[PDB]
Amino acid sequence: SSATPIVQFQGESNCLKCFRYRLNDKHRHLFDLISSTWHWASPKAPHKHAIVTVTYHSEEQRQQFLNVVKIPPTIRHKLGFMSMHLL
Amino acid sequence: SSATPIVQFQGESNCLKCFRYRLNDKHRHLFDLISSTWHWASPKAPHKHAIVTVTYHSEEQRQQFLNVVKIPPTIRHKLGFMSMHLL
C-alpha cells in the first residue's frame, strides 16, 4: 500500500558485495529490487558499515526470502519499510 | 627449499577480498604472504576468475591451514608451488 517491505544488510563492503552477487545468482525470485552498496556519510552516522537495501513485493515474499536464504554471520540484517512512493 | 608451497584461490573478486580479510583476522599465522586479487589478461586466459595467491613457510603450515580453514562456496582452490626467489 503506502509502504514497501525491505531488508537492509550491513557489513564490510567486499563481503556485502559478495553476498549481493550470491542473491543475484541464486535468489532473484525471492526479492524485487536490490541496491548498490552505500553508507551513511560523515561522522554523524548510526554506524559506518556498508549497506545494501533489498525490497520485496509483499510481506509474504520477504518472509519466504528469510526462511530460505542463509545470511552469513558477518552480515547483519534489519527489517523495515520505506514509502513505496520512493521507488 | 628453492620452492615455496602455495594455495591459489579463485572466484568473484569481492568474494576473494572478503575471504582475504577473514584469513588475516582469524588465520594470519597459518599462512605467510597473500596477494591482491589478480587475473590472467587477454583472450588467451585459461579462465576468467579472479585469483588470490597465498604462500606458506612450509608444507606443514599449509596442511594445518587446509585442516582448519573453511573455504567459502564461491571459492575453488588449487595447491602448487612457485620459486621462492620470486617472493
Curated annotation (Swiss-Prot), chains A, B:
Any GO BP annotation: regulation of DNA replication
GO molecular function: DNA binding; DNA-binding transcription factor activity; nucleotide binding
Annotated segments matching region DNA-binding domain: 3-87
Domain of life where this protein originates: Viruses
Localization: Host nucleus
Transcription regulation in keyword set: yes
GO CC aspect terms: host cell nucleus
Key words of the record: Activator, DNA replication, DNA-binding, Early protein, Host nucleus, Phosphoprotein, Repressor, Transcription, Transcription regulation
PTM section of the record: Phosphorylated.
Entry function: Plays a role in the initiation of viral DNA replication. A dimer of E2 interacts with a dimer of E1 in order to improve specificity of E1 DNA binding activity. Once the complex recognizes and binds DNA at specific sites, the E2 dimer is removed from DNA. E2 also regulates viral transcription through binding to the E2RE response element (5'-ACCNNNNNNGGT-3') present in multiple copies in the regulatory regions of the viral genome. Activates or represses transcription depending on E2RE's position with regards to proximal promoter elements including the TATA-box.
Family: Belongs to the papillomaviridae E2 protein family.
Subunit structure: Binds DNA as homodimer. Interacts with protein E1; this interaction greatly increases E1 DNA-binding activity. Interacts with protein L1; this interaction enhances E2-dependent replication and transcription activation. Interacts with protein L2; this interaction inhibits E2 transcriptional activity but not DNA replication function E2. Interacts with protein E7; this interaction inhibits E7 oncogenic activity. Interacts with host TAF1; this interaction modulates E2-dependent transcriptional regulation. Interacts with host BRD4; this interaction mediates E2 transcriptional activation function.
Protein name (Swiss-Prot/TrEMBL): Regulatory protein E2
Organism of provenance: Human papillomavirus type 6a
Residue range from the parent sequence: 282 to 368 of 368
